[PDB]
Symmetry: D2
C-alpha cells in the first residue's frame, strides 16, 4: 500500500481554507501556496537519516547531527510547482532544483511533458516533487516515470489538494512513493477538476487564464 499522510495541523488547514476563497488575489494565493508548501516540507523531512559528528563549537568540541547522504533535489512541476518551491527551499536552500514542465490536455485530461532537466547522480538522492493539485494523477505519474527512468529510488510527493481518483491512480502506478497532502477532497467534476478543490491553481498563481 502507498504511504499517505494528510497534514491536519491547524495552520495548514487554516491557510488551505483561505486559498479556497473564490475572490482571493493572485498575490495572496501565491504567498499561501508557498507558505503551505513550506509546512508540508517539514512533515515530509521528519524521517530524514542523521549522523553524529564532532565540530569546533563556541566552547571547544561539541557533537552535532547532520543530514546523511547527498543533497536533496526539489522537483517543481511547471508552472504551478514554482508557486510552492520557495517554501521548500526555505528549509533546504542547498537542494538541487530539477525543473519538470507538464501541462494537461483539457480535452483528454492526459499529461503533456514539454520540459525536463534533472540533477546528476539522482540515483543517490531523495526527490521532493511539488505540485499544488493531484486530480487524475496523470501529471504526477508522468513525473515519477522520468525520475525512476533517471534512476531515482527515494521519492516524496507534496501537494495542497488531492482527489481520491488521483490517489488511486498514483498508488497502483507507483506505490513506493510517499504522498503528503494538505487535504483529501471529495472527487473530480465532469471537466476533471478537483471539488471542492482550488480551481485552476496554475493560471491563478501565474495570473493567466
Amino acid at each position: 500500500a502507498m504511504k499517505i499522510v494528510e497534514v491536519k495541523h491547524p495552520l495548514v488547514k487554516h491557510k488551505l481554507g483561505l486559498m479556497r476563497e473564490h475572490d482571493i488575489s493572485t498575490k495572496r494565493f501565491r504567498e499561501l501556496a508557498s507558505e503551505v508548501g513550506s509546512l508540508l516540507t517539514y512533515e515530509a523531512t521528519a524521517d530524514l537519516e542523521t549522523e553524529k559528528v564532532t565540530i569546533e563549537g563556541w566552547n571547544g568540541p561539541v557533537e552535532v547531527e547532520q543530514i546523511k547522504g547527498k543533497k536533496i533535489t526539489v522537483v517543481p512541476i511547471l508552472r504551478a510547482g514554482l508557486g510552492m518551491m520557495e517554501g521548500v527551499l526555505e528549509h533546504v536552500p542547498s537542494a538541487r532544483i530539477s525543473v519538470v514542465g507538464i501541462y494537461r490536455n483539457e480535452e483528454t485530461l492526459e499529461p503533456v511533458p514539454y520540459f525536463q532537466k534533472l540533477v546528476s547522480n539522482i540515483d543517490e538522492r531523495m526527490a521532493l516533487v511539488v505540485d499544488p493539485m493531484l486530480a487524475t494523477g496523470g501529471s504526477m505519474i508522468a513525473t515519477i516515470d522520468l525520475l525512476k527512468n533517471a534512476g531515482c529510488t527515494s521519492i516524496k510527493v507534496l501537494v495542497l489538494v488531492a482527489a481520491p481518483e488521483g490517489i488511486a491512480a498514483l498508488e497502483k502506478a507507483h506505490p513506493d512513493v510517499e504522498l503528503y497532502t494538505a487535504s483529501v477532497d471529495k472527487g473530480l467534476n465532469e471537466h476533471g477538476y478537483i471539488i471542492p478543490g482550488l480551481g485552476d491553481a496554475g493560471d491563478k498563481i501565474f495570473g493567466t487564464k
Copy 2:
C-alpha cells in the same frame, strides 16, 4: 500537573542548531538560522491550536473550511536577543501581536513593556534564544500573568536543566519548546555546550 517540555528532535531542527554551534559561523548565517529554527519551533507550539468549521464561498460554490478560534496570538520577544527570533515566529503567524518586554537583572525588574490589549484572552509565545538560569524568562512570565494571561508557551533555541527546573517550579502551567536540552552552566551562567553570547552573535556587536 508537571511542566510539559518538548525537545524538538526533527532532523532539520537538529541540523540547523548544530550549524549555529560552529565557532567560525558568521552573524549573517547565525541570524538566519536563529529565525529558521524559530519558525520550526512555532509550528510545533501551534499544533494544538483549536479550530472551528465555517462556510465560505469556494471556487465551486459553498465549502466548509476550518479557522483558528479565539483572538490573535501575541509574540513576546525579550530585549535584546528575543528580537532575533521574532522574524521566524511571525513567518507562520504574521497577524500575531508583538509584546516587547525588557527585564533588568538587579530580584529582576522590568524596565520596558508594551503588551497587547486583552492579553487575558490570548496565547502568548515568549521567545528568547537561551534559557540559562530562567531569571529573565520567569520575570517576563510573572509580568504576563499580572496582565491576566493564562495561556503561555516558551520558545528557546537551547535550555539548561537549571533554567528548566527554575521555570517548572515558578510556572508549571507554562509549556516549554526547545531545539536542545544542554548539559548545564559554567561558573559565569552561560549554557554549555550552548551557543555563546547569542545576542551579540545575532546583531554582530562584540
Copy 3:
C-alpha cells in the same frame, strides 16, 4: 533610433555581480544574488511607470495618494534560467502576471502561456545572460506578434554581439543589464561572463 541601453552601475549591483563571478560560489549564494540583482534591475526599469492620483481615507481624514496607472505588467521568464530571476522581479511587483515562454527555433516556441490583453501591458522579459541574443529576439518576436508594444529586457550580463543583434531586430525595446562584458568565447559563453548561469542557479551539471 538607437536602442536605449541602461548599464546599472549602482555600487550594490556591481558589488553583488562581482560576488557571482567567484568560481567557488555555491548554488545557494548564486541563486540568492541572481534574484537580489534581479529585483534592483526591476526597480531601475520601473522608474518611468505612469501614476494617477486617487482619494483614500487616511488616519486623519481623506488624503490624495498615487497608484500605478494601466493594467498590471507581465514578467516574461525564458525557460529555464529565466525562472531563476522571476522571484526577484516579483518582489517589488508581486501583482505582475507571469508569461512563461519556451524557445527552440521563424522562431518556434515549444511552450507559451501569455497573459490576456498583453497589447495593453508592459512586458519585463527576464533571462540571466544575453550572449548572441537568439533566445531574447525569438521571445520578443512572439510577444510583438501577440500585440505587446511596450517591452523591457532585464539581464545580469550581456555581450556586445547580443546587444547589437537585439538592437537591429528590435530597436524599440529598452535593455537593462548589471554589466556589458567584452565578448564571447569559442563556445558562445560570455567572457568574463558568469559561466553556465542556468546550471549554477538550479545546481545541475
Copy 4:
C-alpha cells in the same frame, strides 16, 4: 552647507506609501510595506557608496570586480517602529552590524525618552543607516544621532517613510552633516505632535499594540 535631503519619487515608492496611508490597513500588510519601502530607500541611500577595484578568480580566469570600501555598515533601528523597516535594509546589506537604540516619545512633552542602546564597536570607522518610520518633531532622531556622534560615528544617513517640515528643520539645525532619505515630506504636525497626513501611530500599527 545645508542638510542634503532626498525625497524618493520612484512610482513604486509613492504607490506603496499610498497603501500604508489607508486607515483600515491590517498590521500584517502595514509591516510588509514598511520593510519593502525600507529596502527601496536603502538602495537610494547607498547609490554614493565608495567602491574599490579588486582582482578575483572568475569561472574563465582572473577578472577585476568592484567591492564596497571600508568596514561593514551599521544599521541603527530605533525601537520599536524601527524593526519594521530593518528587514528591508538587511536585504541589501545582510552582513551589516545591528546597533539597536530604544526610544519612546513622551506624548505629554514630545521629548524622547532613551531606555536602551547597544552600539557596534569601532563605529568611528563605519557608516550608520538610522531607520525609523516617522520624523515628526525630530527629537528621537536628534537624540539617536547624539549617541552615534558621542560614540565617534562621522558618516550618518537617515531613512524615514514620512517626514514633517518641523522635524526636517529641527534635524538640519542640530546635525546638518547627516543625509535625510524620506519617501515623503508631509504638510506638518497636528496639535498632538503627530504628522499629517502621516501614517498615524506607526509603532502600534507595526506591532499591533494599543
